[model samples]
Target chain A: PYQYPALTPEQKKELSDIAHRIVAPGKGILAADESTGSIAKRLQSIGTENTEENRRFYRQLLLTADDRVNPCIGGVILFHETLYQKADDGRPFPQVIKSKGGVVGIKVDKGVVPLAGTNGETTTQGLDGLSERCAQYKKDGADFAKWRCVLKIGEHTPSALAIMENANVLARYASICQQNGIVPIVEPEILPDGDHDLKRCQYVTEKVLAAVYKALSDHHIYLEGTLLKPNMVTPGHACTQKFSHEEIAMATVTALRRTVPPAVTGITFLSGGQSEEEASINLNAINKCPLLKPWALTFSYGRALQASALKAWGGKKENLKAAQEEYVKRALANSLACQGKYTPSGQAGAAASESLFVSNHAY
Target chain B: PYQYPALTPEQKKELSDIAHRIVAPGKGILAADESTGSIAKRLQSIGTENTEENRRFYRQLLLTADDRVNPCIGGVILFHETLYQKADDGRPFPQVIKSKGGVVGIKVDKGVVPLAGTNGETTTQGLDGLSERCAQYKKDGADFAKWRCVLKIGEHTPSALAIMENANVLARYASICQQNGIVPIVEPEILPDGDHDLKRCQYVTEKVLAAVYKALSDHHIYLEGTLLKPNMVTPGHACTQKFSHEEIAMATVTALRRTVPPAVTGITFLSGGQSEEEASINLNAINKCPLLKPWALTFSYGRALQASALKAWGGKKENLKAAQEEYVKRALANSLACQGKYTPSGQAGAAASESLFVSNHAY
Candidate 1:
C-alpha cells in the first residue's frame, strides 16, 4: 500500500481554500429538495392532497424562489430524484441554480439500513455500487455528495461498532468522491429519536462527529475537500418540554465546534424534519448564539424549505405565484439567519409556521 | 434496529459445541492449500519446476497419502483451484478429505490491498460479493472459509486506523460467512516484517487481536463458531539470532491466550513460510508449553507441508510414491507436533538445517 504522503503545501492550501469558501462569512447552503415521501407528509399536514404534479409544482417554487438566495446560499443540495428535474421553462434545475450562483449538490445515500446489533440505528446504504454512481453524478454537475448515517438511543447507544462502521463507510465514500474530483458532505447523524434531552443529544453528536473526523484523518482524505452535514442537537420529538431557542442554538454550535474540524468547508445542519419556521428560528439562533464558531453554521433542510411551499401550491397551478412567494420568504429568512441577523420574533410569520413532521416520517 | 436475541441457552450450547469440536484433543488443521504464486515460489526454491500438472500431482499425493492423516488433520484448506481438483482415483478433493473425516475449507480472500493512509499494510479484498461466494462454497461442501488481513510494525505501527479498518473488514467477512453457515477462520495477520524484535511482534499481535475480537463482538458474530488463524511470535527475519523452540512457543501461546476470546474454535498458526521441521517443532513446543490454552493450537501451513514433497516428485510419475511418502512423513510429523508428541531427532529429513527466516510475508 502506498502510505499517505505528508500533506503537500499545495494540498494543504486546497483544503483550507475550500473550507473558507463554503463557510465564508455569512455564507451557507439552502437544502431545497425533499424526497417524495417527505413531501407527501408536508402536503398532508397542510390538508392538501399529495401527488406527483403537486410535488413538482412545490419544488419548482423553491428552486425558482428568488435571486436573494444566491447571496448567502453557497450551495443547494438536491435529493436523487430532484437532481434531474427541469423548471417549467425546460431549463435544467441545476442550470437554474447555477445561474443564481449556487453550487449544485446531491444526496447519494439510499436511506439507511438497521445495524443488526445497534439500538434502532442504521448505516446508510447506496454504497454497494457507490463508486460508479458518484462518477455519474459528478459528470452530471454535482459538485458535492451527501450521505446520512443515523444512530439512535439505547442501553449502550451509539455503540462503538455503529460509530466506527458508519464513520469508515462515510470516509470511504468521501475518498472515492474526492478521487473523482467531487467534494463530499459527510453526515453521520445521531438522530434525536428518543426522549433524550438536548445535552445528551449534544454529547452523542459530539462523540459521533469526533469519531468521524478521526476516521476521515485515517482515510487520508483532505478535510478541506469535505463538508459536514449534521443534526441540530435538540430534545426528542416526544419530550414534553421544549428548549429555548437560544438554548437549542447554543447546544448546536457547541456540539459542532467541539467535533467538527475547522478545515471542513462548512457544517450544514439537517433540519431532520423540523417545521419550516422552527427550523428557521433554530438556524437564526444558532448563527446568533455566542460561541467560537469555526465553520459555516447553516441549513441543509428538506421539510423546512418545502412544507410551506407545498401548502401554498395545494396541487394547483392557480397558486403558483403564492407558492413561489412562500418559497422566497423562507429563503430570505434563511439568508438572514445564516448571516446571524434574524431576531426570534421576525421568524414567527405564516411561511415558517407549518409543522413538517409526520409520524413514522416520509423523507 | 432489531437486536438479535442474546445467545439463548440453546444457541450458546450450539456455539460452544462447535468451538470444542474443532479444537478437540489430538488434532490440528493441515493447510495444504497454497496459492499459485506461493506454490511457484516453493517450486523455484526446490528446483522442481512449476506447471499445473506438477502442482496437481504434488497435492494429489498428499490427499491420497493415507487414513493416518484423518486422525491428525482435522481440516485441510484449499485454494480456489484446488477446491475443485480431482484425485487420480477420480474422487473430488473435498470429498476425499470428508470421506476420511476431515473438514474442508477454502481460502476466500482476494489477497490484500494497500490501506491508503497506513504504513505498507493491507486489509483483505474478497468482501465484494462475498456472501454469495460463501453460499456457493458451502454448497461445494466447504465447511469453513478463510480471509487474511495484514498489519505490520513501524513508527505508529498498527495505528488505530489500520486496526479499526482491518477489524471491521474481518468482522464483516465473519458475519457474512456465518450467515451462510460456513465457519470463518478469522485471520488478522501481523506480518513479522521489520527489524522489530520478538517482543514488539507479540505486543502488536496482542493489540491487533484485541481490536479484532472487540469488533467481532460488536458485529454480533457468534465467536464460538469462528476460528483464529494467527502468526506465531518470533523475531523479524533480520534479527540475526533465533529463539529456542521453547521461547517461540511460549511467546506465541501467551499472545494468543491473552487476546483471543476463549470462544474461538481453534488457534491455527499460519506457518508463514517456516521450514518444515522448524514449523513442526514449534507446534510441538506450543502444545507442550505450560499455558492455559482454551483453543486448539496447531499448524495450518502451506510451504512447510509440501516443500519436500514437491522436490521429491520433480515432475516424474515414477517418483510419485516417494513424493506421497514424503508428504505423509511431514503431515505425520506435524500432526504429532500438534499433539506435543513429536521428537525432533532430525525427523522429516527435508527439515532445514538452520533457521529459515523469510521476512514480511503472507500465507
Candidate 2:
C-alpha cells in the first residue's frame, strides 16, 4: 500500500484513551497556560504588576475552586512555570489537577515567528528539540501538550503561506508529542480580527482545518491519539453583520464535520475572545444543532473561562474567595453547555457578558 | 460568490495571456536558469572553470539558436545573473528571448530550508521579498516567474509538512507574481530518488498536486494565470521493475486529470534525471494517451535540452556550431514530441542518453 502507518496499534490506543478522557461527556478544558507576556495583559487590566507571586495566586484561585468543578474540567493546560508552581498548601499544581480527576497538559511552542514576504503573517516556532521536551513533560505529570499556531483573516492576510506553514508546524508538533506518549492538541487558531463576516470565517476555518488534517495524514500522525483545538466558526469581532447562535453553531459544526476525520478522538474548541455567555451559548447550540458529529465537541477556553474570575480577583488576596466563586460559576455553566443542557441565566448583567475581545489577541 | 478573487479582472487577463503564450500549442519552456552553484557542476563535468563569461556564453548559445526554434520554444527561464547578461551583440537576454517570441522568466526562490520536525524534509524559501522582485522583473520585460520546490519519494517522506509547506509557498509566489502582471509557473518536482515503483510516485504526485491546487484556490490565485511544471510519473532509479512509456504516460496523465484544474494554462513536465530520449518519448506518449486532457501538456526541460549540446560544446568556442546544432535538434524533437509527432532517432550512442539521476539533487 506504500502507506506505512506512522503509529503502532498500541500507540494509537494510548493516544485515543487520553484524548477521549479529556472530552468525556459534560467535560471540557481550562486553558490556563497563557504565556508570561499574555498573562501580563490580564493582570495589567486590574492595575496589578505582573509578579510571580501574583500570577501564582491567581492560578491557585482557579485551580482550588470548589470540587463542583471536578466533573466540569476534564483537562487542565498549564504553562511551564505554572506546571511547577506550588499551591498555598504546597501541593504542586499538577498534583492538584490529578487529584481533581483532570488530565495535565503543558504548552510547548515558544511563540509565533514572522514569515518574511507575508502580509504581517506569523507561524509558531518552538519545534526545535520538541521530542526530548515532550518526553520530559510526560514524565513530569503531563499526559498531553498544546502548541498553538495563529492565522489572521484579511483582504490578503493569512496568506496561503500562513495557513500552510502553521498547519505543518502543528502537525509536526502533534507527531512528536505522540511518539512520547503525550497527546497533542492540534490547535490552528484562526484569529477573529478584521471586518470579514461569518461566511468568511467559516470558509477560512474549513480551509485551515482541511490543510491541517491532510498534513496530519501526510506526517503519518495517529489521528486517534490527537485532539483538535480550533476556533468556532463565528464572525469577525468588527464584522457589521450579526449571527444567531444557531447560525454560528451550524457553521461551526458543518466546518468540523467536513474536514475532521471520525478517527480523531475529539475536538476541544478555543473561545477566541468570544464573550463568556456567547462562548457557552454557541457551544450549547453546536451540541444541539442537527448534525452527525463523530468527534466530541467541547471547550478548551482561556479568556472565556477566566474573564469573570479575573475581574473578581482584581489582583487582590482579599478577593480570592470571590474569584474562586466566579471560576466555579463558569465551570458549572460550561459543563452544562457541553451537554447542551445549559439554561441561560435570566439576569444578563454579569461582567462575564461583556465583550472580552481585543484585537489580535496573543493569549 | 464567497470566492473573493485575489486579482482584479484586468490583472487576471494580463497574467492569463502571458501564461497562455508560454505553453501555447506544441511550444514549451527552455529551463536554462541553473544557479551559479548548480552550473558549477555542469561546468566541472566538462572540466571548465565556472566563470560568468562561460555561463553567459552558454546561455547565449541556447537563446541565439536559429529561427527554426522560434515556434518550438515559447519561454526561456533565466537565472538572475543571466537575466541581466547581454548576448554577443550586446542585446539583453530578455530582449533576445522576446525577439524570438519567447517569454522571459526568472527563477525566484532562494533555496530550500530544513523543516524542523520531519525526517530531513525541507520547504523552499525566497518569498522574503518576492513581490518587489516580481515587480522589477515585470518592468524589465519578464512575463513569467519560476519557483522550484522539491519533494522526495520514500516510505515516510515527502512528509505531510513538506508537501503542504512547499505547495503553499508556490501559491504565495503565484499570488504575488499575478499582482505584477507576470505569470507563475508552479513547479513541485518529486525526486526519483528511491527504489519505489511507478505506483508510489503516482500516489505521491497525486497527493502533492491536489494540495497545490487547493492552496491555489484558498489564496484565490487565478489558475488561468499559472502553469504547472511537474515531474513525469516514473519508477525510482533503483526500482527493479520496469514500465513502458505508455504506462508512465497513463499514470502521469491520470494524476494530472484528477488534481489539476482545466482553468490552468497548461502542464509542462520536468525532466528530473531522465535521459533526453526518454524525456521526449514519454512526452510524446503523454500526448497520445487516450485520456481526455483539458490543458496543454508539454516540456520545461533543462538537462534534457542541453545534455547533448553540452557534450558537443565541451566548453570550447571552436565547437560552438556543433553545440548549436545539437541544441536545435533537441528543440525540434521536443516540439514534435509535444505534438506527439517525434520520430526517435535510431542512434542511441550519445552521452545525453546516459542516466542523469542524482540521489538528492539540489537545483
Candidate 3:
C-alpha cells in the first residue's frame, strides 16, 4: 500500500543505459556547458572577444576534434546555445557529437541565488517549469542534463543550509530530469576557497554528499539513472600545507565510501581549479586507490580539459587545429587516468601543469 | 557576499517571545486544529452527526472552558474554519482564545501528499502562494503556524527520501512563516505504526531530526522563533516489547539532545494516538529525565485532550459544562505533566486510557 513507483521499468532502463554509457570504461565527459557569462571569462583570459561567432567556433573546435577524442570522450555537456548550433559542416551540435560516440547533455539550472539569513550562502534556482524544459531538451537530442549547486569552506562556512539547500536542489533537478527521460548530472560542488586542511575538506565533502544522496533518495531519484558531479577531496585553495596526490586520493575515496551508496551508476569529478596535469594525476591516484568504489570514477571537467586548448587557440581561427590537438591530449590523458593508466605525473608538459585556478570560481 | 538577513532583530525577538510564551512553565498547547474531515472522524467515534453547528459548538466547549485552564493552556492551534468562526457570544475565536490567555495558531499545510517512488511515504504540500496567505493570516490573528510532515517506521520505512523531502518542506514552510512575522511550529511526526522496537524508533527519530535541523539551518530559519512538535521516541505501536514511560522519556530526550539545536525555543510533542493518561505520563517522565535539555518540553495534543470530553458531552447541549470540565481536567493534567508534576500514571480512569490510535492516521 505504501509503494508508489516513480518511474516505469522501461523509463528506468533507458535512464540507466544513458548513465552507464556516459561512464563507459576508459571514457569520461567534456564539461563544455560553461554559461555565456562564464565563457566570457574564459575568452577574456585568452584575449578572445566574447562574440557569438567566436563562441560557436570554439565549441565546434572541441566538438569537431580529431576522431582520437571519439573513444576518449563519452559525453559532452553543452551550453543551451551550443546545443542548438550547427557545426560548420551544417550538422546540429548534438548530431555532430552523437556521430563521435559522445552523448549530448545540456546545462539546465538558471544559476545560484542568495539564501536569506545565512553567512554568505546560496541555493541553486531554475526549478520552475523544469519538467517542461527537460522534456523539450530530450526531444532536442539532449539525453542528459547538468545542474550545479555550490558550497564553499571557511570559518562557519558551507553552513548546514548551504549543504542541504544545494543537495536538495540537485535532487529536485535530478528528479525532474528523470521524469522527462534526461539523465541528470547531480553536481554539489564544494568550492576550495579557504585555508581548511585536507581533512576538513574531506569532512565537508562527505557531509555534503551524504545530504545530496539522501535528498536524491527522499525525492525518489533513480540512483542508477544519475551521475554525481562532485569536487575531489583536496585541501582548500589557500591552505599552506600541500598533500600528495595519493593522500588526496585516499581521503577522496574513503569519504566517498563512507557516504555514497553502491547503487549510483557513476561519479564524474569536477576538477575544481586544479592544473590539467594535477587533475589527471589525482584522478589516476583515485582510480588506483585500494578501496571499494562501486561506481565508475571519471572526470567531467571544464577548465582542466580546456585550459591548454584555449591558450593555444588564443582567438585565432588559424590556431584551431593546435587547440583541438591540445584538448585531445588532455582528454586522452584523463581517459587513461580514469582507467588508472596515466603515468609520468612528472615530466607533465604541453603547458598542462600550469594552475588554472581562479579564486571563487563560478559557473 | 552570501549573507542575506531574513528577519530583523525586532522580528526575531517577536518570534522568540511568542515561542517562549507557548511553552511557558507548566503550560502546554491544545491542538484543536483538526481539519473538518478529521473532525468528522472524531464525531463519528462519538456517534454525533458531522455538521458545522455541532463542530462550532464542540469548539466553543473547549475554548470557553473554566478559568482554571487559563494558565494551563499557552496556545490554541486552529483549523482555518475554527480560526475565523465566532463564539455564540459573537467574539472571533482568536479573540476568545486570547481573552483566555492563549496564543492563536493556524495549521498552514494542506496535508500530506503521496511521494512517488516510496513505500507509502509522503511529503507535506500547500507551499504555493504561502507568503501571501501568511501575511493575511497574521492580520487575522494567527501568531504562529503549524506544518506537519509525517514519517513512519518499517523494514524500509522513513526512507532517505521521506526524511529529506519532509524536512525540506518544513523548512520551506518555516522560512515563509518567519518572513511574515509568524512563529513556525515544525512537526516532523514519525507515525507509531509497524512493529519496530524502542531502539529502532530512536534511531529513526535521530536520523530524521538530524536531516530536519540541517535543512532548517540551510533554509536559514530563525530557530528561536520556531518550535518542534515531534513524536516522542517510543517503541512502534505493534512492537512486542513493552517499555516503561521513563524508558520512552529517556529515549525521546536523548534523541532530541543529539540533534535538535539549543537555538530552537521549545519542543511541543504530539500525542501520536497515545491515551490521555499515557501521554501525560510520558510527558512527565520526559520533563523529569535528567539531561542537558535546553529547550522547554511540553505537549501539543489533540485527541488526547478531547477524548474524554467528547465521551462526556455525547454531543448534547445540556452536557456542555460537563464536557468543558472534562476537557479542562485533561488540559490541567497535561499542564502538570509539562512541569513534571503529574502523579499516578496508574489508576487512570474516565476512559482516558483507551487507545485513540487509528491505523495509518492522517491529518
Candidate 4:
C-alpha cells in the first residue's frame, strides 16, 4: 500500500540540517528579496533611483556589514535578480553570504492571483516549472527556498478557497523543493489590515496554520526539514483596541503550540507592517513567554530590518558607514531579542520607533 | 467586523427544505447521473450498444418504475445530457421526476485534475464558471447539486494537498450552489482501493471531514442548506481481515459524530462497490446501531441500485417489466433497511447477491 518514500533519509537529514542552521541560537533570516516593483517604493522613500547598480549596492551594504551581523544573520534570502548579482568586490552575493557563515536562500513565488467567485480573495501562483527552478538554484548556491502566500483579515475576506488553495500550493512547492536539495520555508503571511482585535487575529492565525500543517502532513512532508514564516498574532493595524507586547507574545506562542508539530525546525516570523522597535520588543517577549516552544522562534523581517538603515543611507555614497551601522544595530538588537536579553533603551533610534506600516504590504 | 450574510434566512430555508425532503423517512436518492463515458462500460457488460437511444431507454426504465419506487426515492440526479432529454411521453426528465414527488439534482463537477508533487493524488475541477452553470441549472429545474471530490487510501496517497484542495473546492462549489438557490450535496469520498484495515479508513475519514466542515465554516457556508454524501467507513477492498455489518455501521456513525455538525441536513451513503444486498444489510445495521445519529442516514447509490436492475433487463424490451420489478424489489427492501426492519431473506434474487464492488469507481 505504501509507495516509495517522498524523501530519502539522507535528503531529509540535509534539509533538517540547513533549516536548523538558519534558526540556530540567536539567529534569524535577512529577507532582502523584495521584487523590483516592491523595491521601487523603498528606493523612492529614500529619494534614490531604483537602478540595478543602486539595488546591488544596497544589498552589498547589508551583506558586508562589518562582522557584527555575522552571528545574528544565519540565512540571507535573495530575489531572482539579486541572486546572480555580484558585489563591488566582484564576488557573487551568495558567496559573500556563505563566506560570512550564513546559508543562502532564494524567493521562488511569482505572486498572487485573484480567486474567481470570491470577494477579492487570492491564491499565490509560481508553481509553473518550480521543480526545475529549485534544481537549478540548488546547483547555483541556494541551500534554502522561500515562497510567500498571502492571506488577509477582514469581515469576510481570506475566504476558505484562499486559505485552502494557498496552503495546498505551498505544500506542493515544499514537496518539489525537498525533491531537490533546497529546504523550504513555508510562509503563509496573513495581512494585518482590518479593524479586528487581537482575539480575532489569533483565531484566524490558528485556523490558517492548522490548515497549513495538515496539508504538509498530507503531502508526506518531513516537518523537521522545513521552517515556517508566519505573522505574529496581533490586532489589525486599524484596530481600535490596544494590546501589550506580552499579550501579543502569549497569543502568538499559544497559536503555534495548538497547531505546529514539535518536529518542525523553526518559525521565522515576518514583521508584518510593524515598526523596528515594536518587532524587536515583541520578539523579546515571545522568547520570554512562559509556554514551552518545541521549535526555534526567530525573525524573517524585510522592512523592520532595513527601515532605519535605508533612511540613514540617504541615497548617498558618503552615508555608507552610517547605513551599515544602522543595519548592524538592528541585527544586534534582534539577536539579543531572540535570546530574551534585550531591554528597551531607546538606542534603536527615533526612526525605529516610527510605524513603518503600509496597508496590504507585499514583497 | 462582519460582512453581508452569504445567504438570507429565506434562501437558507428553501435549501434546507429541499435537502430534508431528499432524505426524509425511508427515502433516498437515485443516482442516474453517469456520464456518457461511464455508462458505456455498464452497457458493454450486458452486450448492448452504447448509443444515445439505448442510454435514454435505460434511464427511462428507471425513471418510469412503478409507484412503489416513488416513495423510496426522494430525489433523482441527472447528467446534463439527460436533463434535457425527454421521456417517451414527451415530457422532460426533470418534469417526470418532479411529477413523481421527487426533487431534481444535477451533477456539476467537470472531472479531477492532478496535483503535481504527490503520490498520484488529485483535486476536483469545475469552478471555472460554476456560479453561472448553477444559476442556469436552478432555472432549468435543478433543485440541488452534487460535486464529488475523490481521495484514495494508501500510504501517503491521499496527501495533504489532495485533502485540503478537494475540501476547499467542494466548499466553493457549495457556496455557489446556495447563491443560486440550489441545495448542495458535498461529497469527499475516500476511495477503498488499498490493503489498509477499517481503523485506518476511520482515521482518514475523521480527519477529512474535520477539514471539510472547517472549510465550510471559513467560507460562511450555510450548513443547514447542505447535505453530505460520503463513503461508509469500511476496510479497503484488498484487506485480509473481515468486519461485520455491525462493525462497519459503528465505524461509520462514530466518524460522522466526531466531525460532522448537527446542522447538516442529512448523510446519504455512496454504495461504493458494495453488493446490493450487502449495501442494504449494512445500512440496516447502521440504523440499528446503538448510537445517536443527529441527521438522516440513507442511500445515494449508483451501481448498487442499477446492477441488479440492468441484469434483469438484459437490454431488451421484453425484459422491461422484469427490470422494473427488480428495481422495485430492492427499493422496497432498502426502504425497510433504512428503518432497520429489513430481514435477510432470499426474495432479493441472485442478481442482488452478486458483488458490485469495483476498484476506485469513478461514477
Candidate 5:
C-alpha cells in the first residue's frame, strides 16, 4: 500500500480537536510533569522534604487554582505519579483539570539516556511499549502526551547523530500517541547552555527543526494532531551578546517560519529556566513578531509558572492562598502575553525574576 | 570530559589502512555479496540450478580468476555463505581472496524492513547483537563490513524519518564495527527507479549523505576508518533528460564534495543497474572531473561488472574460462576508469551494453 494513513479521518478529527483546544487563543499549558527526582530538587530548594505527600500537595495546589486561572490554562501536563493522584477532596487530578477547561496530558518519556558516542548528548527513552501506555493514558482522562528530547549547541555538539536520533525517537513517540487517540506534544528542546551567539543558535535551531519536521513527515506523523514545545531562540547562557526582546522573538519566529510546517497545531514555548518575567516578555514579543507564524505561539512553562508560587508556599499551609495567588498572577500574565496584550507590571514575586537556570537540566 | 574518542590512534590507523587499501589507485571492491535470494534470481537468469555447490563454484570462479585481475581488484565482498565457503582446493575463501591481493569484506546487515507508517520506506536492520557478530567475522578473516540502506526520491518519499532512521542505523552499525576493528563501508543507496530529474537525484543524494556523515560524527565514528558506498548521482532511470557523462560526474562529485568530509578514507560508487560500459564511462568521467575530491572514487558493482560474465557462463562449466575472461575485461576497464585512464574497447561481451536495472533492488 502506498502512503498508509496512520490515522482514520475520525481519529484525525479527535486529535486535531484536542490539540486546538490546548492552544486556544490566550491559553497555554501548565507543565507540572517533573519526574520525582526533579521535583525533589524543587522541594529541597524550599527546605521541604521530598515526600509523595508533598508532591501530591504541590500538584493539587496548581490544579485547584481559582476560576480566574480557567481561561489562562488550556492544558495541564502531569507526570505519571500526578496523573493518578487525587485532589484533596477525592476527585481525580484529571477531573479537576477537565473541570477547569484544561486538557490533561501525561509525560510519556521515561527520561534521557546518554548517547554512547556523544560528548554529553542524549536521546529520550520510554518508547518500549509506548503505544500501550498511550492507550491506557487516553482511558485515564489524558487527551494528550508530552515527550521531551533535548539537544545542545557546542563547538561540535548536538552532533548529527543526536539530532537525527532524537528527532526519530520523538516521531516514533508521536506516531504511537496518535494511534491511541492522544494528541502528541512533540518537544525537541535545544538547550541554551553554551556560549554561542544568537546567530549560531538560530542556525542550529533551523537545522534541528528542519530535521525534526522532516522526521515527522517521514514517520507519516499527522502534523495537525500535534503540538511543538520548542525553546525560544536565545543566546547561550554565557554569551556576551545580549539581544533585545524583539531580537530573540525575531530569531525564534524566523527560524520557525523557515522550517516548521503550517500544519502543526501550535507551538508551546518551554521557558527553559528563563525568569518568570523574561519568559512572559519574550513570549509577548514572539506573539507580536511581524513574521507570519501559522501556529499558535504560546507557553508550556514549568519553572516560569511555579517559581514564584513555590517560594510563596514555603511548604506551609498558611501560605496556600498566597501560593495559589502567585500561580494565578503568572498564569494571567502569560495568558495576556500569549495574546500580545500584557504590560509588565513592576510587581515581581519573590522568585519571579530569578534565573532558575540549572546547568544541563534534566526533565 | 568532552567528546569521548571512540577509537584510539592505533585503531584509527588500522581502519584507515583497510579502507584505503580497498580503494587504492586503480583498484575497487568486487561486490559479490548478493544474498541467497538475490543470487537465486541471478542463477534463474542464467538458467542454472541455485544450490550450495553452484554458489560455492561461482565464488571460487571469481576468487580464482587469473593473475591478470590482481591489480584490477583490491577488495572482494562476500555474502556470509561465500565468506565461509572454501576453494575446491580446500583453502578458505578468505585465503583465496588474500592470495589474489584482495581484502575480504562481509555484508553485515540483515536486510531492509518496512517502516510502519511510511510509503514503502524501510530501514535496514541487523543491529541486534551486531558487535559480537563483527568480532567473530573479523576473526573469520573479514576486515570490513557492508550495510546498505536505500532511500528513493519521490513526491513524498525519502521522508525525513527514513533518511534519519537509515542514517542513524548506519551510524550505529558503523560505530559497532569500528569498536570491533572493522572498517565500515557505509552504503546509503538511493534507488534510481523514478522519473525524477538529475537535479532532484543530486539534491536527494546531498541531503542523504549530509545526514549520513553527520550521524557518523555524532556517533563518534572515525571517518578515516570508513568507506562510503553511494549511488552515483544520476537522473532516475525513467527520466527523459539525457545527461552527459561529464554532467553526471559533475553532479555526483559536486554533491560528494559538498558533504563528505576530507577525512573519510574512500568512496566506491555502486553501479546501480547501469549498463557495463555506462558504469565505466560515468566512473571514468567522475574520476577525471576537476573537483578536489578528497577520497578515492571507484566502482563497487554487482550487475555492471558481472552482466557480461554471467551471460558468458550461461550456467555451463565449459564457459568458466570464457566468463573469467569477460570478468577480467570489465575489472580491468573499471580499474582504468577509477584511475581516469579508460578508453572504450569495442569488444562488447554479450550483455556489455544491456541495461541492468531492477526496480527496488535489494542486496
Candidate 6:
C-alpha cells in the first residue's frame, strides 16, 4: 500500500455513522429508474412503442406511487435521463419522488469502458467531472449516487485488475460524495454473464466485494455515508445448475457478512436483470437467511419493478390506470420483500407478468 | 482477485512503454524547492530572516551552481512560490533550471489535513483543483509535479487508514498530472517521527508502497511516466538504535524492489532531514545494495543539501563563494550517489558537517 495519511477520528466516525444508518432495520432501496433502453423493451412486450413520452410516462407513474412505497424504499436510484424529466402534470420527476418521502440518487458512472488488458472486462468512467456533477445532483434532491463497474464469469472472471480498478473507483466516488453530504451506493457488479456455476459466482462476488471494501478503507472514505449496491450471487445466465431461492439467499447473505463493513449504511442488491418474481423471492429468502447480517439486506432494483408496469402502460392514456396498478403491485411486492415477508407463490396479489431480459442490455 | 479486462495488444504496449521510459538509467530528481517555512528554518539556523527575497536569492544560487549539475539532476521539484520567482538579474528561476538541462517540477499539494480518526496524522490536500493547476504549471515550464503525503511510526503507526488515504491522494495526483503531460513523482512519505525500529519501518514502507502502486493501477494512471520519492528505511529519532548506512540501504532497496513497479521512471529518496553525509552515504549504499533494483535510485534531498549551503551563505556577499562551493559539494556528492559511485572517505572533502538528527524529529 502507498503511504496513506491516517484519518482523523472524526472522519472515521462520520463514515461509520453513514454506513450504519442506511442499513438500519427494515431499510432497503427501490431502484425504479430503469434506463430508457430497459423500459423500451418492457413496453415492447405489451405491443407499445418504446418512445421518450412512453418512457417518461412509465417512470413518472412509478415515482408518483406515493408515500406508501417509502417504507420499503429508503432510496430511489434514477437514470440520468429521468433525473430532469417531468411527470404528466409537469412536476419534475425528482420533486415527485421527494414528496413521497423517498431519497433520490443518480446513477453517475458513464458506463463501462473496455479495460486495456483484461478478458472482456471493463473499468467504469464518469469520474472525469463526477465530483462537480454529484454536487449539483445533491442540490437537485439526490441524496445518494451509484456507479456500477461490472465483472463477469468466465475461465478467468473478475481478474485482479478489474476488481481493484472497480473498487478504487467506488472508493473515490464514495469519498467525493460524502464531501457533499450524498451517500454513495458503491456497486462493483460481477455479472452472471457466463456459464459458471453458483460457487464460482460466489467466489468472484466475494473477492470483488472484499477488494471494494478494502479500497473504501484505503481511501479513508466515510463508510457510514455509503451504500454497497452489489449483485446477488446466483449461477451464470447459461448455467444449467438450478439454485433454490434459499441457496441463493444463503450465498448472498454470507458473502455480505464476510466482506461488507458493519459501518456501511446498507447493502442493496441489484436485481441484475432478474425476473420480477425471482428478484423479490430472492430478496425475501435473503432477508430470512439464518445468518446475522451486519448490514441491511434489501433491493435496489430497476426492471424488476418496472417491467410489468411498462407493459400495462402500453403508452396509452387508457392503459394509465392499469399501469399505475401494475406499478403498485411490484412496489408492494418489494415492500413486502423489504420486511422479509414475501413468499414465492408466483404472485403477490398480482401475477408475475413475463421475463424482462434484453439480449444485449445497455444499462 | 477479480477478473482483469482482456487487453488489446496496443494497450499492453502502451502501459509497458510508461513503465520503461521514466526510470531509465542515470535519471533521478533534484528536490530544489523547499517551502517558505522549511527554508526559513534552514535560514534561521544561520541567523538569517526568512523572506521572499531570501528564498529567491538562495534558490537562485543553487540553481545557478553550474551547468555541470545537469548530469546528476534529471528533474528539480519546485515550490509554487519559486515557480515564478526570479534571480537577482531578474531571470525566472524556471528558466534557470531548464537552461541547466533539468526538468522543472512543482510541489502541488497544499499541505496536510487532519485525518478524522487518527492521532494527529494527516493526508495531503491540493487535489481539489489539481488538474487545472497541472495545466497551468505545464505552461509555466514544469514537466513534472510532486505531492508529499506524510506518515509516522508508533505502537500502531502507519495505520491502514493513513496508508490508504495518502496512497489515494498520490494516485489522484499522478492521474491528473499525467492527463496534462506532466510526470508525477508519486511520493507517499512515511515520516521518521517516532522510536520505531528499521524493520517496522521496512514493513510499513513495503505495505504503503504496495498500496500506492495498486492505486496507480486503479486510477488508470500511466506508471511509466511517474517517479517515486520515498524515505530510506531507518530507525526513528527517539530510537537509541542506529543502523549502518549499508543496513539502511539494504532494507530500503529491498522494499522498493518488492513493491514499486518496474515501469516507474525512477526512485528519488527524500533526505528525511538526514545530514548531507548520511544522505549521500545511505543513497550510495542503496544503489550498491546486493539486489536488483528495476528503477533508477537517486536523491531528492532538501535540508541535507541546502542546510550547509545556507549556513555557508550567512546573508553575506562575502560568503557567496563559500556557499556556492558547499552547494557544489553536496550536488556532486549526490550526483555520485545517484550513479552508485560515491565512496566514503576518512575526512570531509570541503567543509565540516555532522549528524543532524534530533530525537523524535519530523518534516
Highest DockQ against the true fold, candidate? 3
Please give each candidate's TM-score: 0.78, 0.59, 0.60, 0.58, 0.59, 0.66
Lowest lDDT block of 10, candidate 1 chain B: B345-354
Please identify model 4 stretches exceeding 4 Å from their true place.
Answer: A1-363, B1-4, B155-161, B345-355, B360-363
* lDDT digits (tens) for residues A212-233 of candidate 5: 9988876788899999999989
Interface RMSD of 1: 4.9
Alpha-carbon runs more than 4 Å astray in model 2 = A1-363, B158-161, B345-359
Of 4 and 5, the candidate ranking higher by DockQ: 5
Return the lDDT, model 3, position B359. Answer: 61
Residue-by-residue lDDT tens digits, candidate 6, A1-363? 344433446755655654554445555666755567656667777787888877777677777775556665666788888888998788898888777766778887766765543576666666555657877987887877888888777787566766776787777667767766677788887777777888888888888888888788766676766777788888877788777777777888877788887776677888876888778877877777777877677777776777777767767777777877876777778767766787544222222323645353222
Per-residue lDDT for B1-363 in model 6, tens only?
A: 343333334644543444344334554566776788767767787787888887787788788886666776666788999999888877898888777767788988777765544666677667655667888998998877888888888776677777876887687677667766677787788888787888999999999999998877765676666778888898876678867776677788888889987877678888886788878877777777778887788877777777777788998867887888887788788878767777562111212236684334454
lDDT of 4 by residue, B67-159 (tens): 989899999889999999999999999999999999999999988755645677877767655777888999999999989999998767767
In model 5, how large is the Cα lDDT of residue B304?
83
Reference-based lDDT, each prediction: 0.74, 0.84, 0.86, 0.85, 0.86, 0.73
User: Which pairs of residues collide in candidate 1?
Assistant: A120-B1, A277-A352
Per-residue accuracy of model 1 over B1-363 as CA lDDT, tens digit each: 345543455745654554455556666676766789877877676676778876776777778877866776777888888888898888898888888878888888887755545556566666656767888998998878888888878776687778888898899888767766777888888877667788888888889899999889878888888888889997876567666767777788888888987767788888775777788887888888887887787777776777777778776778888887887788789778888888763222222334353544733
Report how far off residue A167 is in candidate 1 (Å).
4.6
What CA root-mean-square deviation does each model show from the true structure? 5.8, 9.2, 9.0, 9.2, 9.4, 7.7
Maximum-TM-score candidate: 1
Off by over 4 Å in 5: A115-119, A345-356, A361-363, B1-4, B10-114, B119-167, B173-363
| Best of the two (2, 4) by DockQ | 4
Task: Write down the worst ten-residue block by lDDT for model 5 chain B.
Answer: B345-354
Q: Which window of ten consecutive residues has the lowest lDDT sum in model 2 chain A? A: A345-354
Q: Roughly what TM-score does model 6 have, to 2 decimal places? A: 0.66
Cα lDDT over the full model 2? 0.84
The DockQ values of the predictions, listed in order, are 0.22, 0.05, 0.27, 0.08, 0.19, 0.18
